[PDB]
């Protein structure tokens, strides 16, 4: 009785370099380096280092996504005099032409973050997000609570739902009736510009999706003390997931199922669920029967890994 | 002898009569044992500890005992035995049995457990956390008569793990997950119960050494090709159910290869197997059943062919005899539009014949021979019975006219010469 | 021959679900018949099922839900504070919470359910809590959708319920009045675990062979040979592996084997694989052409991985 080399003591140490090289090649789309030489033999620009430092500290599209930083307006224009910073933390909108220059189309844009300054924090407060739909009236989107801290730390926001249609903000406090603050743009480069289970139930595919399965507590499992529910679809997922760079399908539907693919880290291509739904279970025991609430039971969307 | 089973008031009852022989203790929540009241009589040989979790061991309290014969541990949670004592016990080396069921043995625990005592026999590891087996862990275990490797997840095995071991008749490492086994270094094995395990190829080496293992099990295995055995002819039974083979030794007499993808069968696979006695090839996607070999089934005592969608089966236009003998001819979920004429008019040894879901349309030429009927059914026969009286001069005992939907008319004409001779009758 | 592997996967999946449930109840096989009558379901159980079926608008341990209700308006309610023009209040006895959830730390999750007439073009919701006798406490703010089918909203109130259980106050409540610019009572669900279902009633630092992650550091200088990337020089490209053993479902079970399964199989997959779940991005920079560019690559950093 003996086994093979299986994963092998030498193979576990090797091939990760090749796997990560292939992953970077596929994500960057560049099969070969762009060019050799013809580069400035000097220190990197300070703006690039500042952007990297801003995006490095702590607060999905498979293709690589470009990040862009927009500088805050210096609060020197015609309408500055209207807002005198009285009982309201003034904020200003940005220049539309440079937004258009950074992001050519809204579809390419995916998400964005906006950051403030946060220094003293003497009293427990709460920071309101506002949106400038009209010059006279505004709406409410979300609220953020801040914990005291001497060292300032940048915080993000949820402008991803509003910057998409901005093709043409304030700061206040709740009232009882009884570095410059830049905004981050993770757009998409123009060069690299091109899940419900019934979708792949209707059309049969050899890729990794969800296949139909039925479970009933009559004879498939062999017991009967579960009274409710009698029947539900406890589906599964299975499929021979291939390598993304070897096949080179380049399809919108195919590329949407590779948000968790990582052969180098996983060391084996497999399918793993990412989002599930809860399931209540009813059974009888003791004087008064009780009901249990089981979460993370039924798989809904399953991708590769 | 006498014993108390199920009574618990303290750690040691201290009331057993002297020169006792039997001692069984279950559902006894023991706390701690000592080596000052453990030896009231040095004549104990049989003991059992089940549902008897205990950890505080006195580092070999059996040294004062006259002898130890049998040992078994049940529902004992040995988790930090490394600093409790060396191994688990050091008694008189005359051990016969030793069970470690439900103790969660680890690599270090297994290394410490097995010591320089070659008389350890009947060692069981059912329900324990074994990951790997090394060469230095089996030292001092030259015999290891009986093996129980249930519920053990052995995924890596060192080349030649079983070295210097002969009494290896039994080996049941069921409910394991080992990828591949391609080398069989064992020199004396009898039964191999590899079942409910995930195997991915079978490439066992061969040679001039005739292996004497009489049982090979490969159930619930995800193979891809037929697991060819070495050239030895010492084997009596084989199980290959719940397997996947893609088709793209004379002592053997038992076959069980159901739930497969049999599409084309080679002539040699049936020619190189003399003297068979059993077969099981049902619920398989078989379509071609051409018969050209002299004895392609040979001799059988049972046949199960349920859930088979083969088109038609024929012996040969001019075959010299069809089958030597046959007892069971079970088959179900078939689409046999035609009826083979030579299948039945060959021998009178047929006992059980049931055409369930067969749609038999036998010609009404006037069955006649093989007047030794003991079981028969006409489920889903298609065409309705037979215009004249069938089964002439044949003693039929069991009849099942379920789901016939044929020519009945309530006359009961076929049930004329078979009514007085009946054992059990049922119909839909 | 395409119906054989499909049935194999069907039986493997149902076996996995059976094993998951048999480990999930953390006990032996219960008697289905027992002594309970086989009569019609009582109103309480169907009410619980209706409350837990509608969609909303340590974590693997058994979570049990209980039902508590408010008291109809009366002198005691209209004694401390009243309603001038518009006010919606829901408050519940602390003794009811104590008899529902015995230990404050034992509580895990809490949800608040509300009924809305669902006939209004515009509406905004504010949540308030009675932190003291004459002061309130700020809570989360959400939005609403002008729908036409009434349904029950869900709110995250785990912290406030934890605080109320930890406090010995006689009576407290919420507050929901309005947006001020300058037989079908609301339900309650408390997720907890019975005392008899408790167990007492990381791997990176140690050396374990399970599905855990350890260190790796590779740069772009020697082992990779990419001289066109100036920064970063290197990063922690951690990886993890794990056999993920499979438990076959049996009728009998032991005690420690429950946690053994809970560590070897948290999702009961047919073919479990030790794969990452939480991923963190990292950006890189390189110079091409005449303009600088920075791109942030996702699915790079791994923290913990499990097979489910
Ligand atoms: C938003 O960004 C755009 C793009 O940078 C700004 O447009 C730029 O505006 C400046 C003046 O503020 C233009 O400079 C002027 O150009 C004319 C061209 O004839 C020249 O005669 C003037 O002497 C002066 O240099 C600049 O050309 C123009 N850029 C482009 C591409 O047209 C815009 O001003 C920004 N918005 C605000 C409110 O600043
Ligand atoms: C039950 O078994 C344990 C074995 O762990 C016994 O403990 C051992 O007891 C002996 C004495 O009978 C100890 O030997 C003594 O060693 C000291 C030096 O440490 C020496 O000065 C004394 O003259 C004597 O030889 C032995 O060390 C000890 N083992 C240990 C502590 O690990 C225990 O006595 C047994 N109980 C009985 C017999 O009731
Ligand atoms: C069981 O007890 C025995 C006996 O005390 C012990 O095993 C002994 O282990 C030593 C050290 O490995 C062996 O000594 C070696 O002998 C060879 C003979 O050629 C020599 O070349 C080496 O340099 C070394 O000195 C000794 O032979 C061995 N004895 C026996 C009977 O195996 C040990 O304490 C326990 N475990 C085992 C596995 O024996
Ligand atoms: C090889 O190992 C397998 C599994 O490890 C053994 O299978 C065992 O088969 C017996 C019957 O042949 C099973 O007993 C059954 O128990 C159920 C109740 O659970 C009862 O309803 C049935 O009528 C039957 O008595 C047994 O559960 C099953 N598994 C084990 C662990 O014993 C097999 O016997 C071994 N030897 C071979 C295949 O030669
Ligand atoms: C020929 O072989 C087939 C299968 O190899 C035999 O069919 C089997 O028939 C028995 C009795 O009708 C079935 O048992 C039944 O099980 C169900 C639960 O599934 C239970 O509710 C019934 O009361 C009954 O016990 C068995 O399932 C069935 N096998 C399959 C695979 O469906 C057939 O009986 C054999 N023919 C002869 C003449 O022996
Ligand atoms: C809830 O609290 C109100 C007070 O606002 C109280 O009237 C309700 O009933 C009380 O609790 C008793 C149960 O222990 C109940 O039997 C009795 O009617 C009443 N007790 C007193 C002293 O008034 C409370 N309901 C509960 C606790 O279920
Ligand atoms: C980005 O951050 C890095 C490190 O956080 C900065 O590098 C430091 O620069 C200061 C000068 O201000 C030096 O005194 C330190 O020795 C540098 N540290 C390291 C590790 O190099 C860098 O200057 C920042 N870039 C910008 C544009 O501010
Ligand atoms: C909700 O209650 C209604 C009223 O009896 C009932 O018909 C329905 O089945 C319930 N829904 C459940 C139990 O999921």
Residue numbers in the entry:
A (entry chain A): 1 to 59, 72 to 180, 188 to 197, 225 to 240, 251 to 361
B (entry chain E): 22 to 269, 309 to 426, 440 to 501
C (entry chain B): 4 to 60, 72 to 196, 224 to 242, 255 to 361
Question: What are the paper's exact sentences on this?
Answer:
Human full-length L-TGF-β1 (i.e., residues 1–361) and LRRC33 ectodomain (i.e., residues 1–631) were co-expressed in Expi293F cells. The best subset of particles could be refined to 4.01-Å resolution. LRRC33 adopts a classic solenoid structure of the leucine-rich repeat (LRR)-containing proteins. In addition, LRRC33 exhibits a 35-degree rotation compared to GARP24 when bound to L-TGF-β1. The Cys4 residues in the α1 helix from either LAP monomer form asymmetrical intermolecular disulfide bonds with Cys201 or Cys345 of LRRC33. The N-terminal region of LAPA inserts into the hydrophobic core of LRRC33 from its convex side, facilitating the formation of the Cys4A-Cys201 bond. In our structure, mTGF-β1B leans onto the lateral surface of LRRC33, resulting in a non-covalent interface of 535 Å2. Trp301 of mTGF-β1B inserts in a groove of LRRC33 between LRR fragments R7 and R8, forming hydrophobic interactions with Phe196 and Tyr217 of LRRC33, as well as hydrogen bond with the main-chain carboxyl group of Tyr217. At the same time, Tyr174 of LRRC33 is embedded into a hydrophobic pocket of mTGF-β1B consisting of Pro298, Ile300, Leu313, and His317. We next sought to determine the functional relevance of such extensive non-covalent interactions in the assembly of L-TGF-β1/LRRC33 complex by introducing mutations to the two key aromatic residues. Both the W301A mutation of L-TGF-β1 and the Y174R mutation of LRRC33 drastically decreased the L-TGF-β1/LRRC33 complex formation and the cell-surface presentation of L-TGF-β1.
